Amino acid sequence: VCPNIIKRSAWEARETHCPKMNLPAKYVIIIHTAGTSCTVSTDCQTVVRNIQSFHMDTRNFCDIGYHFLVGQDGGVYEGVGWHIQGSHTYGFNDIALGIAFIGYFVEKPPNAAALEAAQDLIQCAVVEGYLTPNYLLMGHSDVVNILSPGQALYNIISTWPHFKH
Ligand code: NI
Ligand code: NI
């Protein structure tokens, strides 16, 4: 079953109304926040709240771009959640679930807790039906031209099942 998923009300998400997406998502994109990292709940919460505002205010997104985020606390934060579109990858925001690891992982990778959480969340995703049984996993930089999710992180995920080798 899905990990603890700390809801939007927890980190005080500015509430909005964004374009819902047809849930049988066919892909999974692993992206990294590229910004600061967090190790305790209260810190991750603040970072998530700020990524949303930035995304809405200066990026002009409808809400935070990611469906879910993962902190070094091993906690899984709801982004826009399952039922909403994302603003994370071009032409995939309505068909790919974007999971953002909070922090910067080009050299060093997320800890084992952060990683275990993503895979557990991905699993229930396929199990619950939010992901097609034959969905395809891939890195952010595999679809668009971006320095994400970082070598370290990339090398780990390329290891996971259904990864688009
Ligand atoms: Ni599970
Ligand atoms: Ni474990």
In angstroms, the Cα distances linking 85 to 7, 39, 137 are 17, 27, 18
Name the closest ligand to CA 112. 2
Q: Which residue in this structure is represented by tokens 């320095």? A: 147
How many whole angstroms from 53 Cα to the centroid of ligand 1?
Answer: 30
Per DSSP, what are the bridge partners of residue 21? Answer: none
How was this one solved? X-ray
How many whole angstroms from 114 Cα to the centroid of ligand 2?
Answer: 10
In angstroms, the Cα distances linking 87 to 17, 31, 68, 139 are 14, 12, 12, 15
In angstroms, the Cα distances linking 128 to 22, 96, 116, 144 are 14, 15, 18, 28
**Three-class SS state of 105:** coil
CA 103/CA 82 separation, integer angstroms: 22
CA 104/CA 81 separation, integer angstroms: 22
Do residues 109 and 152 touch, judged by C-beta distance below 8 A? yes
Tokens for 5, please give them: 């998923």
Tokens for 74, please give them: 């091993």
How many whole angstroms from 152 Cα to the centroid of ligand 1?
Answer: 24
Vertex 48 angle, CA 142 and 93, to 5°: 35
In Å, what resolution does this model reach?
2.8
**DSSP 8-state class, residue 120:** H
How many whole angstroms from 115 Cα to the centroid of ligand 1?
Answer: 13
CA 94/CA 23 separation, integer angstroms: 9
Vertex 91 angle, CA 20 and 19, to 5°: 15
DSSP 69-101: EE-TTS-EEESS-TTB--SSSTTTTTTEEEEEE
**Class of the CATH-defined domain 1-165:** alpha beta
How many whole angstroms from 116 Cα to the centroid of ligand 2?
Answer: 6
Tokens for 99, please give them: 């999971």
Which residues are close to ligand 1, an ion, with C-beta < 5 A? 1, 120, 124
Q: Name which of 131, 112, 109 is nearest 121 in CA terms.
A: 131
Q: Which helix (H) or strand (E) element contains residue 118?
A: helix 112-128
What residue spans define the domains of the chain? 1-165
Name the closest ligand to CA 4. 1
CA 41/CA 49 separation, integer angstroms: 12
CA 58/CA 151 separation, integer angstroms: 28
Tokens for 122, please give them: 């991905």
How many whole angstroms from 80 Cα to the centroid of ligand 1?
Answer: 20
CA 134/CA 144 separation, integer angstroms: 22
In angstroms, the Cα distances linking 78 to 9, 44, 49, 133, 152 are 10, 11, 11, 22, 24
Do residues 73 and 38 touch, judged by C-beta distance below 8 A? yes
How many whole angstroms from 58 Cα to the centroid of ligand 1?
Answer: 36
Question: Which residues make up each annotated binding site?
Answer: 55, 59, 66
**DSSP 8-state class, residue 142:** G
CA 93/CA 98 separation, integer angstroms: 8
